[PDB]
Amino acid sequence: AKTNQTLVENSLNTQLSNWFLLYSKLHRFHWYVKGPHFFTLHEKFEELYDHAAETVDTIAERLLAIGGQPVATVKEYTEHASITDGGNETSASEMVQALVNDYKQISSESKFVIGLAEENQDNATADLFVGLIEEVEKQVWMLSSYLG
Amino acid sequence: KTNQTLVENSLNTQLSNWFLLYSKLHRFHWYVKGPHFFTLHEKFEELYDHAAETVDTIAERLLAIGGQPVATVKEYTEHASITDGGNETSASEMVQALVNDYKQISSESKFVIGLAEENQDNATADLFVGLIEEVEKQVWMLSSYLG
Amino acid sequence: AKTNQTLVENSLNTQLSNWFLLYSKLHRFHWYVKGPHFFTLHEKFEELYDHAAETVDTIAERLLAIGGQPVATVKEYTEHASITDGGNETSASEMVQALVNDYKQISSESKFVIGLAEENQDNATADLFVGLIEEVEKQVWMLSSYLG
Amino acid sequence: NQTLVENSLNTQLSNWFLLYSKLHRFHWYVKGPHFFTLHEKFEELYDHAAETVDTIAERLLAIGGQPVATVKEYTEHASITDGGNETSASEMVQALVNDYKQISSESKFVIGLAEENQDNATADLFVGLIEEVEKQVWMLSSYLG
Amino acid sequence: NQTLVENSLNTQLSNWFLLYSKLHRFHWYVKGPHFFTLHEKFEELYDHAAETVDTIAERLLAIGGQPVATVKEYTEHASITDGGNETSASEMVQALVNDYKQISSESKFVIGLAEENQDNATADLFVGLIEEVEKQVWMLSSYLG
Amino acid sequence: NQTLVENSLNTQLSNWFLLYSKLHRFHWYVKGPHFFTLHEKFEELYDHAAETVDTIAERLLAIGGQPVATVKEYTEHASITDGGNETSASEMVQALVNDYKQISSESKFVIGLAEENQDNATADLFVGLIEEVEKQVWMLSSYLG
Amino acid sequence: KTNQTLVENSLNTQLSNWFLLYSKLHRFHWYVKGPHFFTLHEKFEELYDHAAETVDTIAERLLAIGGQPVATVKEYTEHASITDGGNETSASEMVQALVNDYKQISSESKFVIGLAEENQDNATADLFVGLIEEVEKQVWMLSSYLG
Amino acid sequence: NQTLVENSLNTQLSNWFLLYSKLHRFHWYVKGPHFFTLHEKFEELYDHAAETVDTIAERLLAIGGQPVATVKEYTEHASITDGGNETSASEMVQALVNDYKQISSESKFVIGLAEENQDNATADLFVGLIEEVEKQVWMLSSYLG
Amino acid sequence: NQTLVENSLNTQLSNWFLLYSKLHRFHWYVKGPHFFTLHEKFEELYDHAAETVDTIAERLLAIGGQPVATVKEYTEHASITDGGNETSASEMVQALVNDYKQISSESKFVIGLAEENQDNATADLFVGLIEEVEKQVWMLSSYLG
Amino acid sequence: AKTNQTLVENSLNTQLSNWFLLYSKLHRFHWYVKGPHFFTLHEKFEELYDHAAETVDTIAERLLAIGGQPVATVKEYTEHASITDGGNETSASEMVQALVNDYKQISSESKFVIGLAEENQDNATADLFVGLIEEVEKQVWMLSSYLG
Amino acid sequence: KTNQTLVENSLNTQLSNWFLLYSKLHRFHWYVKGPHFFTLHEKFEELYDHAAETVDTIAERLLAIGGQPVATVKEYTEHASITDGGNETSASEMVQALVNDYKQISSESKFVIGLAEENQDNATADLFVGLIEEVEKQVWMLSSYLG
Amino acid sequence: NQTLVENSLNTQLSNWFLLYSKLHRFHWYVKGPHFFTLHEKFEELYDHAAETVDTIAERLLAIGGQPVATVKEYTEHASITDGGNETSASEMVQALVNDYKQISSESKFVIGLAEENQDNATADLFVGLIEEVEKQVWMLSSYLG
Questions:
Q1: Is the dihedral of CA A64, A66, A68, A74 positive or negative?
Q2: DSSP 8-state class, residue I32
Q3: How far I120 CA lies from chain L's nearest CA (Å)?
Q4: Which residues precede a break in chain G, with C-to-N distance above 2.5 Å?
Q5: Long-range contacts made by residues H79-86, C-beta under 8 angstroms, separation at least 24?
Q6: Which is the most buried residue in A49, B14, C31, D141, by most CB within 10 A?
């Protein structure tokens, strides 16, 4: 009950941390992408980081609204995330693949947050993450199509 | 009484709550005073604009499911679980009245989802899920103001 | 003098109450109108209630600006208005007729407020209600034309 | 479970493309004194139908399916038709009511299938749809009232 | 060939100004349960008539002619009238159908004169006008159907 | 009292339609190095005139009157004319000054009639008008200065 | 002295008041401090934008009626019934200065209507009627802030 | 002459609806490193195809004809197909080049029939369509070059 | 027939680029009390010239031709020049009247060649250009009148 | 050093005062311009006063940001400016010439402020006035061209 | 070490400072409380929007001059001269933290101009000149709030 | 000092007009699968080039100079050319890199000249330019990477 609530809050802090580190990674890809798909991917990556920033603010405000305490420092993001903004990507295909890998991991982990939220009778927290899955699975299809 | 009628009746109570809230927010918009006047006068208008949208959305959902929305001030008064009455005078008193009404609206909206779900009405539950998200955000903001 | 002022304030509270109850009635008509003029009248009624809401805020703020105390609860609106949001309208023509009846009553009563305001040397309060008469008499002509 | 979901999306995709078609027929052939209102309303509805076509196809693709994508396949996979012999404004509006009512029952069945397959995002898409279609069923039924 | 074209433009400029006038009369006097639709439609149509007036006059100027520009001249040069005793909604709409059809056939003669004078640009102006009026004729005729 | 008000609105309605006409003549025929400025200013003024035409007619209707609505009636009920033989930019601008000056005196007389008939809303419409016309009289007189 | 000249002269005083008010509002915009800084810094800009519009409207009406608007800072100083000077330091002092000047402007604008009406100039009276409405609204808002 | 024009418009209306369909198939199935560019381009092109469908149908109506308006009729009256086995990006783009070129030459025949019936306005519609499709042909051919 | 059309488009593309250049010279050097009006007008006109350059070139591409695309080629293929010794406002405006009139008559020859090659779409491009330039000729000539 | 700072602050107060008096002058020209260039110059003068108002606010806020105290009364503007809003202009050419004269004086004086700002190692204050010179020298060229 | 490398390295420190500032401003946006909640919650978002624009501008300038921007949170932490850490709780504490970081950023940006100028890189200096203008404005506004 | 500044602006003005020209050649002739991206990017760049042309000319005028204003003078005063025989997308992009790199070195030299003549505003204009060109050099070099 109190444990159910704490499990939900902790899971939101992990996802908040993932989305902040993804916003960071997307800057790295925006800045270092090269080759003849430069214009397309430089722009796409900025669109994606704008969406990541929105998501950061949406998760943190939902956590606050349920009585929790969002993590809010880069050291905390690094300690609580299940992903990293690091990596050794150089080519356009490696960058696009890296994003497919992070968005697939976020989709699976968001499904686990829905289960926790539902177990705590928190339909609004569940609904937030259902909407996220929709958006990230769309981008996995587009990014996977780029690579096909 | 019926699974259907229980859903319709619960939508009429919430329709009534949101209209009475629109009313109370006008009273606060008009009588708020002190050095947070500008901020709160404006915030209360933004909130009543949201309340008016919510009134139309709930009534239109009720119609879509075959019900009959209440649609006079006498009926809103008789069907609501909150009131537009009160003797709030200070900015803090007004903000705290809103926290109380939004908290009530959130708990009852969670009960609506349960009724709707039991009547296999996922679309009605979803409207209330969305309202819970917006109201609990406002509860956080207004409680922060008082903190 | 003080009586002149109190008569003006009381008259504004009656009109504020009328316009709030009209905003309510217009919702009822928006929701329950039927027949082949549904799209036209559903939309028209929303336009009209948007205007009623504006008018509510304009009268209440003028009352405040002259040192008065607007009524601000539905119980007060019901006790101070000269009209009602109630009624037994079912057809599109009955709904449109009901509005012609309320807008004509508001126009006559607003002319009486101009006389009171002028007697108290309150030109700005008079000007508010002159502008209202213009708008409501336009709508009476359009709504009466629908019914002709 | 997964194949049943995919197949159900292709039926609904097909229904929405055939409704887009039927709405053009009514937009073009409506007549009588409610011409202006209904010619415009039918265009609004087909714009919504087109958006719904793209959203369902793109969800199907994101879950690893293959959207049907020819008029022959739509005809074959749909549970409605774009045919009929409606002539008056009321016949046209009543035909829309019937199709939207059918789509809404079928969409509730899709939600159950998706939920049983633990696919909450696919289910959410059909929930939203039901909201919009049942609004239109109320509005169109009210016109006939 | 050139003075024929110029005189033919003056007659059409006159027609469009008189139509602008008639469309105000219908906007103001239309009644009955299609009031909102027709009051608004008649405004949209007069806005189009005023744009057309300015485009004809300015093409006449551009070819070296002298557009008529007083109501006495418009009455004197037009082939339609702004007069009439229309009262019902149907009478007003039927009156517009009549005028627009006369405007189309006469604009086809302007095209032929223009083409005979190797004035493609004037012809093109009127081709576009015919496209617009015949659409309005279909719409208004559909209202009456 | 009421009939005198109605008749006075029909005169002013007529004046404004004939000014709309005269402004098109000046828009089309202005020449010399102030062409661009004045061709554009005359269009702005006729857009305002058209709006004033619709506002006066709709007020007349709201008070239970019957707006005149043909160019023959405008000619007959107006206190100005759309005729004249202005040729230079200054002649055109001076003719506008004269008409706007006349309209403004006549509008003050309308306000007295309306006030005597206890019609404050009709009176308000002409007050607003006077504000706008006297602005234009200052601007046009300054051009001539 | 004349019915006409009395109207023209009263418009020059009000033109001058509104320009000096535009000036004072800049001083407040620039020097306001304390925790209502953001709200008041912004409000004072909105108010000076309105004052600038009002200056142009009054001058253009004066021109339209055949008068000559004053149009230098020396003349504004000499014709105004208010000043842009003052030693206001606190937010409350600045807001109260504005309430005082707006109240004065409203009472004198009512006197203008009377002069204009006596010269059968309804259009000039109407401009001032509209100004009274806007200023008295602001007086309510600013007084509420101090309440 | 008139029934030939009408039948020729039905065939083109059919072609544009089938192209709208094919463009959805390519939007959904395109893959490889030009995905973002082509997915978006194919949407822009289908938006244009839908506008074209409505403009043809409404011109057919305006001349007194009866537009086809079911997918069975479009299949029955069209000269292209929405079928095909395109998989690669190049195959899809080449397929669009083929269809647009067929649409251009056939639209040139519509122009000649229209002109023979003194229907300049219908001809003009198709002249504008040829301008747009041949630009797209150049662009798409350039992609393949 | 086809190589004649292509060469004729190159000459017009060249003319529009050189006009763009000349219009910059006039924008920069115009003086006297019509400065604000003419400085701005000359910018509006060069914006139109740049749009025209791109539309001609892209039509040439669309028909299978090779647009010229260096200033040495524009000088070599044009029938006007961007040179000249215009100093006064009147000289600059008169120079534009001269160029626009030459552009119109030459565009009428392009229309005839295009029509002889059954290229309606190219012809239509130039018909629209003539409409625009002759309006500008009237406006600029009016300035000088 | 402290003297360097005080010289910069005083120079900004003189320019703030110039720009306020120019805003005033531009109203006078907007209201009293006459002749056949009326429409053009009435509009141009309003555009210019809108720019002067912006400049007023920009200089005053820069002065505040460097620790100074902007003058903020018309009496102070009159005492600190190097220009006046007064004058005996009647014709359109005299008005346009008067503005050329003030904008040329402002450009020269702004160059002197750049020298003072640079001597105090204040690059941002210098940059503000470089941007002003660009704009005012553009208008001197246009206004001088009107008169050529 | 080189005139070029000194410029590149100084841009990486400032890039890092602006990203960590974007972070701190989120923490303040989320935890600010008390009666200035609405004003400050909104102000802090406007400031982080500006910080994000600044991050992209500095990184893109560094790239244009042939450098390599740092682009992970570990590197931002190691290269910055400020931190996103802190225990600020009150509105005044948060506003004062911002004044401190903006003042630091302004002084170091002046040092960058000097390095850039010594490497004949006027375009890099100009980017920093513009940042100084915006930051010192904010320092005035935030200090006024505390006054 | 002053004459050296003026002469240097005329060289840079010329460079920017010739780059505007070269960007149209590449916009029109680019081919291969990066067609859509590069056809659009080249148009964005020529819009920027046109704005840069007007800004440099207007600065030159404000300092009392005389901008060159014919294609013959641009050819003669420029340090680059709009000629060349680029054919592939990479050749086109590499040619842009070379021109932007050259413009940027030359603009730094202009800044020194302007500073030595105590002209900080002219110097500022070239600083801003360097910022924008070096951005494009990074983006274009990255495409080639």
A1: negative
A2: S
A3: 23
A4: none
A5: H79/H11, H79/H14, H79/H15, H79/H106, H80/H15, H80/H18, H80/H19, H81/H18, H82/D70, H82/D71, H82/H18, H82/H19, H82/H21, H82/H22, H82/H25, H83/D70, H83/D72, H84/H22, H86/H25, H86/H26
A6: B14
Query: ∠ CA(J49), CA(G54), CA(F139), 5° rounding?
Result: 70
One-letter amino acid at I136 equals Q
Q: What's the per-residue H, E or C state across H82-117?
A: CCCCCCCHHHHHHHHHHHHHHHHHHHHHHHHHHHHC
Q: Domain I1-145: what homologous superfamily?
A: Ferritin, core subunit, four-helix bundle (1.20.1260.10)
Quick count: other Cβ atoms within 10 Å of Cβ H129? Answer: 22
- φ, ψ of residue D63 in degrees (nearest 5): -90, 0
The resolution in Å comes to: 2.0
- From chain L, the residues in CB contact with I69 under 8 A are 21, 24-25, 28-29
Residue indicated by tokens 């000619």: F75
Residues 6+ apart with CB under 8 A from I107: I12, I126, I129, I130, I133
L95 touches L84 (CB < 8 A): yes
G84 contact residues in J (CB cutoff 8 A): 73-74
CA angle K57/K58/K63 to nearest 5° reads 100
Chains contacting chain B through 3 or more C-beta pairs under 8 A: A, C, D, G, K
Chain F residue whose CA is closest to J41: F143
Residues of K in contact with L137 (CB under 8 A): 64
Q: Which of A139, A115, A141 is nearest to A126 (CA)?
A: A115
Q: How far is CA J75 from CA E135, J79, J105, in A?
A: 68, 6, 21
Chain center to CA of C58: 12
Name the H helices within J33-147: 38-65, 74-80, 92-119, 123-146
CATH fold group of domain C1-148: Ferritin (1.20.1260)
* Token pair 């000539």: residue: I141
Q: How many interchain CB pairs under 8 A, G with J? A: 50
Verify whether the Cβ–Cβ distance I39 to J142 is below 8 Å: yes
- Kindly tell me the burial class for residue K92, based on how many C-beta atoms sit within 10 Å of its own C-beta (0-12, 13-18, 19 or more): middle
Q: With beta carbons less than 8 A apart as the criterion, state whether J142 and I36 touch.
A: yes
User: Contact A113/A15 with Cβ under 8 angstroms?
Assistant: yes
Q: Which residues of F touch G126 (CB under 8 A)?
A: 124, 127-128, 131
Helix, strand, coil shares of chain L as percentages rounded to 5? 80, 0, 20
CA distance I34 to chain J (A): 7
CA distance J2 to chain K (A): 18
- Contact (Cβ atoms closer than 8 angstroms) between residue G130 and residue G111: no
Enumerate residues 6+ apart whose C-beta is below 8 A from D12: D56, D103, D106, D107, D110, D126
Question: In the PDB record, what is the listed experimental method?
Answer: X-ray
Q: What tokens appear for C6 in the block? A: 């109190």
Taking the C-alpha atoms of residue E55 and residue E16, their distance in angstroms, rounded to an integer, is: 11
Boundaries of every domain in chain L:
1-145
Looking at this protein, which amino acid is placed at residue C127? D
Interface test with F, best of G62, G121, G122 (most F CBs within 10 A): G122
Q: Please list, in sequence order, all residues whose beta carbon lies within 8 angstroms of the beta carbon of residue G91, skipping any fewer than 6 positions away.
A: B35, G32, G33, G34, G36, G40
Query: CATH number of G1-147: 3.90.930.12, 2.60.40.10, 1.20.1260.10, 3.40.190.10?
Result: 1.20.1260.10
Alpha-carbon distance I88 to nearest alpha carbon in chain J (angstroms)? 10
The residue of C127, C134, C140, C145 whose CB has the most chain F CBs within 10 angstroms, and thus the best one to mutate to test that interface, is C134
Length of chain E: 145
What distances in angstroms separate CA F54 from CA C133, F16, F17, F59, H138, one per listed residue?
A: 18, 10, 10, 9, 50
